[PDB]
Design a protein around this ligand. Structure first.
Ligand SMILES: CCc1noc2cc(OC)c(NS(=O)(=O)c3ccc(OC)cc3)cc12
Length: 131
C-alpha cells in the first residue's frame, strides 16, 4: 500500500460566476478591464499570473498549505468579462490578494517577487489614473 495513492491535486479555482451575487457595470470596472487588466496581461512578467497556480504542474506541493485565498489574473479577467463585480474596490482587492500571495509564499529578491513587484508598480500607475 505505502501511501503512493491517493494523490495530491489542485483546489477548485475561485468562482468566476455567481448568479446570486450583486453586480453592475461602472466606468471604473470597464477601464479596469479595457486598460488595466489588458495592459498587464501582455507584459512579459504576466505568464505566472494568467491562470490559477497549478501546484501539481509546477512542483509546489506546499503552495496551498500556505496560500488559502488564491487569486490570479485569469480569474480576475473572467470576472470582469462576466461583470461579476459590484464596484472597482472588489476587483482591486483581488489584484492585491494576487500580489500579496506571491510576496507571502516566496522570498524577497526571488525572481518571482521581482516579477510581481514590476506588475504591481505598473498596476498602481494605471490605478492612479482611474475615472
Ligand atoms: C504566482 C505563481 C507563483 N507564485 O510563487 C511561485 C513560485 C514558483 O516557483 C518557485 C512558481 N513556479 S514557476 O514555474 O511559474 C516559476 C516562475 C518564476 C520563477 O522564477 C523566475 C521560478 C518558477 C510560480 C509561483
Amino acid at each position: 500500500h505505502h501511501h503512493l495513492v491517493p494523490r495530491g491535486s489542485n483546489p477548485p479555482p475561485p468562482e468566476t460566476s455567481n448568479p446570486n451575487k450583486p453586480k453592475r457595470q461602472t466606468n471604473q470596472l470597464q477601464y479596469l478591464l479595457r486598460v488595466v487588466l489588458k495592459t498587464l496581461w501582455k507584459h512579459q512578467f504576466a505568464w505566472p499570473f494568467q491562470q490559477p497556480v497549478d501546484a501539481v504542474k509546477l512542483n509546489l506541493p506546499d503552495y496551498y498549505k500556505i496560500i488559502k485565498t488564491p487569486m490570479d489574473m485569469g480569474t480576475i479577467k473572467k470576472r470582469l468579462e462576466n461583470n461579476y463585480y459590484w464596484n472597482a474596490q472588489e476587483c482591486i482587492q483581488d489584484f492585491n490578494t494576487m500580489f500579496t500571495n506571491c510576496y507571502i509564499y516566496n522570498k524577497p529578491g526571488d525572481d518571482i517577487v521581482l516579477m510581481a513587484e514590476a506588475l504591481e508598480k505598473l498596476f498602481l500607475q494605471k490605478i492612479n489614473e482611474l475615472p
